[PDB]
Protein backbone atom coordinates (compact mmCIF):
# COMPACT_ATOMS: atom_id res chain seq x y z
CA UNK A 1 0.00 0.00 0.00
CA UNK A 2 2.04 2.92 1.32
CA UNK A 3 4.76 3.35 3.95
CA UNK A 4 4.25 5.85 6.75
CA UNK A 5 5.06 9.19 5.15
CA UNK A 6 4.86 12.57 6.89
CA UNK A 7 5.69 15.88 5.23
CA UNK A 8 7.67 14.62 2.21
CA UNK A 9 10.15 16.60 0.12
CA UNK A 10 9.57 18.23 -3.27
CA UNK A 11 10.37 16.01 -6.25
CA UNK A 12 10.70 18.33 -9.25
CA UNK A 13 13.15 20.88 -7.87
CA UNK A 14 15.56 21.13 -10.81
CA UNK A 15 12.75 20.78 -13.35
CA UNK A 16 10.97 24.13 -13.04
CA UNK A 17 10.97 27.29 -15.17
CA UNK A 18 9.49 30.77 -14.78
CA UNK A 19 6.53 30.90 -17.18
CA UNK A 20 6.80 33.84 -19.57
CA UNK A 21 4.76 36.66 -18.04
CA UNK A 22 3.69 38.02 -21.43
CA UNK A 23 2.76 34.54 -22.67
CA UNK A 24 0.23 34.21 -19.86
CA UNK A 25 -1.35 37.60 -20.57
CA UNK A 26 -1.24 36.73 -24.26
CA UNK A 27 1.15 39.41 -25.49
CA UNK A 28 4.20 37.34 -26.42
CA UNK A 29 4.71 37.28 -30.19
CA UNK A 30 7.94 35.35 -29.65
CA UNK A 31 8.28 31.63 -30.40
CA UNK A 32 9.90 29.12 -28.05
CA UNK A 33 13.24 29.33 -29.87
CA UNK A 34 13.00 33.13 -29.85
CA UNK A 35 11.73 33.97 -26.37
CA UNK A 36 14.08 33.25 -23.46
CA UNK A 37 11.17 31.67 -21.58
CA UNK A 38 9.07 28.49 -21.55
CA UNK A 39 5.63 28.58 -23.16
CA UNK A 40 3.60 25.50 -22.10
CA UNK A 41 0.74 24.41 -24.40
CA UNK A 42 -2.92 24.07 -23.41
CA UNK A 43 -2.62 20.30 -23.02
CA UNK A 44 0.38 20.63 -20.71
CA UNK A 45 -0.62 21.36 -17.12
CA UNK A 46 0.64 24.77 -15.99
CA UNK A 47 1.61 25.35 -12.36
CA UNK A 48 0.75 28.44 -10.33
CA UNK A 49 2.85 31.13 -11.98
CA UNK A 50 5.20 28.30 -12.92
CA UNK A 51 5.51 25.21 -15.12
CA UNK A 52 7.31 21.87 -14.83
CA UNK A 53 9.66 20.83 -17.63
CA UNK A 54 9.32 17.33 -19.07
CA UNK A 55 11.99 14.77 -18.18
CA UNK A 56 12.31 12.72 -21.37
CA UNK A 57 12.20 15.94 -23.39
CA UNK A 58 15.57 16.92 -21.92
CA UNK A 59 16.94 13.86 -23.71
CA UNK A 60 15.45 15.05 -26.99
CA UNK A 61 13.05 12.15 -27.48
CA UNK A 62 9.77 12.12 -25.56
CA UNK A 63 7.19 9.32 -25.55
CA UNK A 64 4.42 10.55 -23.25
CA UNK A 65 1.51 10.95 -25.67
CA UNK A 66 -0.45 13.43 -23.54
CA UNK A 67 2.71 14.71 -21.84
CA UNK A 68 1.59 17.19 -19.18
CA UNK A 69 5.07 18.71 -18.87
CA UNK A 70 6.31 21.30 -21.36
CA UNK A 71 9.48 20.81 -23.41
CA UNK A 72 11.84 23.76 -22.83
CA UNK A 73 14.38 24.79 -25.51
CA UNK A 74 18.11 24.10 -25.29
CA UNK A 75 19.09 27.71 -24.61
CA UNK A 76 16.79 27.25 -21.61
CA UNK A 77 17.81 23.72 -20.60
CA UNK A 78 21.04 25.23 -19.28
CA UNK A 79 19.16 27.35 -16.73
CA UNK A 80 17.81 24.18 -15.12
CA UNK A 81 21.43 23.15 -14.58
CA UNK A 82 22.59 26.52 -13.27
CA UNK A 83 20.29 26.00 -10.29
CA UNK A 84 20.42 29.69 -9.37
CA UNK A 85 20.91 29.81 -5.61
CA UNK A 86 24.29 29.24 -3.94
CA UNK A 87 24.55 27.38 -0.63
CA UNK A 88 25.30 29.65 2.33
CA UNK A 89 26.38 26.80 4.58
ZN1 LIG B 1 7.53 34.75 -24.11
ZN1 LIG C 1 7.40 15.11 -22.75
Amino acid sequence: GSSGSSGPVRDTKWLTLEVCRQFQRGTCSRSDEECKFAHPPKSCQVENGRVIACFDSLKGRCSRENCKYLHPPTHLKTQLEINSGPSSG
Side-chain angles (χ1 to χ4, degrees):
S2 178
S3 208
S5 284
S6 52
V9 299
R10 272 178 70 83
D11 160 54
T12 52
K13 185 182 176 160
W14 60 289
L15 298 166
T16 40
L17 284 172
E18 270 154 25
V19 178
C20 179
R21 179 152 150 278
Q22 293 308 260
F23 167 57
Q24 274 293 327
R25 307 177 73 203
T27 182
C28 172
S29 284
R30 294 213 167 208
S31 77
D32 38 65
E33 192 86 288
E34 279 176 347
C35 204
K36 70 191 154 157
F37 290 98
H39 310 158
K42 190 158 79 75
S43 50
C44 286
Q45 187 270 352
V46 179
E47 211 61 84
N48 52 78
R50 213 179 289 284
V51 65
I52 300 170
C54 181
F55 177 61
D56 282 60
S57 69
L58 301 175
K59 296 281 282 172
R61 40 165 83 276
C62 178
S63 168
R64 276 158 172 276
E65 290 182 24
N66 66 334
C67 200
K68 75 154 83 204
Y69 318 115
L70 161 77
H71 307 205
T74 308
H75 65 266
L76 280 184
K77 289 184 202 301
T78 310
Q79 291 210 123
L80 292 167
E81 300 207 312
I82 300 169
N83 275 83
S84 173
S87 205
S88 209

